[PDB]
Write a protein that binds this ligand. Structure first.
Ligand code: HEM
Ligand SMILES: [Cl-]
Length: 393
């Protein structure tokens, strides 16, 4: 009663144009089996949302990648937050919630906004820039590592470690194996910077250690929690910002709208997160036999949630493939949903908004002026290079 499909959602051919295959996955049925990897898939909005919000049956403590931690050893010690279920998840989640709090956003908003304005003006002096290297990547690298309190030495390891994390959620294909193999220098840099003497006071990493006084986390838990913030955050925001510029380049009406009302910058970024879904997929593992979309799934089965597909499901979204900066994005699952919803979402929206605000106020046109290249990752969708010509306002 369950349709078996041969689509490999982690194949380069898939990454290059996933949307036809995502309609095939949605329309085949509410639950599919992927014979290439022996996992269940859900690609419609309603089932993805249901799985995300049913953590006791669809757990994360057995890994949110293909690998099942009950069967194989994780390639690194499990995240205390992403790879945990309630109640073990609860206290590290509260710490990160507070470290990346609304109140915290007040402390960094002016520095983050200033860097974004400065960068767009710098790029407007240039003309043809790569919207990935020069902007999507350059801007987050100029604000987040400082906000973490990271030292200068070794930052060259930061993007490699992020790309490795998200490749590692994937199946054991060449992308994953290449990433994991000879990754020890990236792991060694990160693990060393998770130690308290290495984190500048007042930054995110030092504030995590300062919570060890409260009884919420123990001193030995703090370095792994800091690791979360050296794992998440950078790559997804990079891809999301690069996607926004791309959409603003491909939908010029929406740039003109945003120019006429820069207070749309925040929803413009949220809509870019829905439209691109920089985090395409996460896994759950079933804790029991469960009925989902009429199919009975056994215990200990991997379930692949297509977040990006769920964000373009026409059963939920009008004109899902159109970028609409006045769309009401509420309910999109590009940040997840339920107990695990992105705890770093205020930092991403902040970086995204202030960059889109900078563009809204200083830029009149964004014209693609060179070969566009995709960046391939088992979990993340984003561009490798986007040559554009910025016309000053
Ligand atoms: C556009 C940017 C981002 C996207 C698309 C994104 C995506 C996601 C998603 C889909 C989840 C839920 C994972 C799951 O349910 O298994 C998640 C959780 C998480 N995110 Fe983000 N994220 C972004 C930015 C950030 C930032 C800026 C940070 C840190 C400052 C961050 C840190 C985390 C952490 C630590 C978790 C684990 C939360 C938990 O398990 O409760 N992310 N992210
Ligand atoms: Cl590590």
């Amino acid at each position: 009663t369950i349709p078996h499909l041969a689509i490999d959602p982690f194949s380069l051919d898939f990454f290059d144009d996933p949307y036809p295959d995502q309609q095939t996955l949605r329309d085949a049925g509410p639950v599919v089996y992927l014979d290439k990897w022996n996992v269940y898939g859900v690609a419609r909005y309603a089932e993805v949302h249901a799985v995300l919000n049913d953590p006791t049956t669809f757990c994360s403590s057995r890994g949110v990648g293909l690998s099942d931690f009950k069967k194989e050893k994780p390639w690194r010690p499990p995240s205390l937050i992403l790879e945990a279920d309630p109640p073990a998840h609860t206290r590290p989640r509260a710490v990160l919630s507070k470290v990346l709090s609304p109140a915290t956003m007040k402390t960094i908003r002016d520095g983050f906004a200033a860097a974004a304005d400065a960068k767009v003006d710098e790029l407007l002096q240039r003309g043809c820039i790569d919207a990935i290297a020069d902007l999507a990547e350059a801007y987050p690298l100029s604000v987040f590592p400082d906000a973490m309190g990271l030292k200068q030495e070794g930052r060259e390891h930061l993007l490699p470690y992020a790309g490795l994390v998200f490749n590692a959620f994937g199946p054991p294909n060449e992308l994953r194996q290449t990433a994991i193999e000879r990754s020890a220098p990236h792991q060694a840099y990160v693990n060393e910077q998770c130690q308290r003497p290495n984190l500048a006071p007042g930054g995110f990493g030092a504030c995590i250690h300062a919570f060890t006084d409260t009884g919420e986390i123990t001193p030995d838990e703090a370095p792994l929690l800091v690791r979360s913030l050296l794992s998440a955050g950078l790559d997804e925001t990079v891809n999301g910002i690069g996607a926004a510029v791309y959409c603003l380049a491909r939908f010029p009406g929406e740039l003109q709208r945003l120019r006429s009302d820069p207070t749309l910058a925040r929803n413009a970024f949220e809509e870019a997160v829905r439209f691109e879904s920089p985090v395409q997929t996460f896994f759950r593992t079933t804790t029991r036999e469960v009925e989902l979309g009429g199919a009975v799934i056994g215990e200990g089965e991997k379930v692949l949630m297509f977040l990006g597909s769920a964000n373009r499901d026409p059963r939920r979204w009008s004109d899902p493939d159109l970028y609409d900066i006045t769309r009401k994005t509420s309910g999109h699952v590009g940040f997840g949903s339920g107990v695990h919803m992105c705890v770093g979402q205020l930092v991403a929206r902040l970086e995204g908004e202030v960059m889109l605000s900078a563009l809204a106020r200083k830029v009149a046109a964004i014209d693609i002026d060179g070969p566009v290249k995709r960046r391939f990752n088992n979990t993340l969708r984003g561009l490798e290079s986007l040559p554009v010509k910025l016309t000053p306002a």
